[PDB]
Design a protein around this ligand. Structure first.
Ligand SMILES: NS(=O)(=O)c1ccc(C(=O)NCc2ccccc2F)cc1
Ligand SMILES: [Hg+2]
Ligand SMILES: [Zn+2]
Length: 258
């Protein structure tokens, strides 16, 4: 039926309705640090989230998204391997039922507890709808989460999860600063890829940060209390909403550091 992460409609079944699932530039991938090429020509990342305007948070049945006002250049990503300006439209996470899994990307086969995706779209295309149809329409900043100390900046997100427990629920989420979710360093790996959920469009330039952020066990626990199902339907805990690593094929992962 509609896609999910369960036994009968999970990643291994997506190819039936979305042929692109077996394409040439699918994500996520495993980052082999020893074969990644240090590219000295990669420019540093430029993150300008000072004028970011969050609007709401919603449970779309696959994860929870915090949406931002992208009507104009308020929160943008430039530099790195990007040509142009990409506006932040939303961010979400992928997590597991256990601390030893949750990330989509792996580093030397190592899985993290979760993964944050800050989704941006190329402004030269006018709207996200057009951007998804282009090979460089999207730029997603990936940040690994590992369990340890608490992340203050993540707490506001954690506190409101009860208001959006089931599919379809949304809550006003204004004045949230995404800068509180960034690690100290902006060193990254980059490669051409795709959305990790259907439609699985290959329109993404992936930028994965080397340094994970730490979140407390209690914070991740709250992610695990969300529901895939809507109100009044049988409870299915939202956990393990991650796609396993895809083959790298004819691609090269570049690194901005050595
Ligand atoms: N996990 S991830 O790769 O960062 C990712 C980022 C954005 C989307 C998205 O916008 N989906 C909706 C959507 C997009 C395009 C066409 C139809 C849709 F429903 C999905 C996955
Ligand atoms: Hg595309
Ligand atoms: Zn994602």
């Amino acid at each position: 039926h509609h896609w999910g992460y369960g036994k009968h409609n999970g990643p291994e079944h997506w190819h039936k309705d979305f042929p692109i699932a077996k394409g040439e530039r699918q994500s996520p991938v495993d980052i082999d640090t020893h074969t990644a090429k240090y590219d000295p020509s990669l420019k540093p990342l430029s993150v300008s989230y000072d004028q970011a305007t969050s609007l709401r948070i919603l449970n779309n049945g696959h994860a929870f998204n915090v949406e931002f006002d992208d009507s104009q250049d308020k929160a943008v990503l430039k530099g790195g391997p990007l040509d142009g300006t990409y506006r932040l439209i939303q961010f979400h996470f992928h997590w597991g039922s256990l601390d030893g899994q949750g990330s989509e990307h792996t580093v030397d086969k190592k899985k993290y507890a979760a993964e944050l995706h800050l989704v941006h779209w190329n402004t030269k295309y006018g709207d996200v709808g057009k951007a998804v149809q282009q090979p460089d329409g999207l730029a997603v900043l990936g940040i690994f989460l590992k369990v340890g100390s608490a992340k203050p900046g993540l707490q506001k997100v954690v506190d409101v999860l009860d208001s959006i427990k089931t599919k379809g629920k949304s809550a006003d989420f204004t004045n949230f600063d995404p800068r509180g979710l960034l690690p100290e360093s902006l060193d990254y790996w980059t490669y051409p890829g795709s959305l990790t959920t259907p439609p699985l469009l290959e329109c993404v330039t992936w930028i994965v940060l080397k340094e994970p952020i730490s979140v407390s066990s209690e914070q991740v626990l709250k992610f695990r209390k969300l529901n895939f199902n809507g109100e009044g339907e049988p409870e299915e805990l939202m956990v393990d909403n991650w796609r396993p690593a895809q083959p790298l094929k004819n691609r090269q992962i570049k690194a901005s550091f050595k």
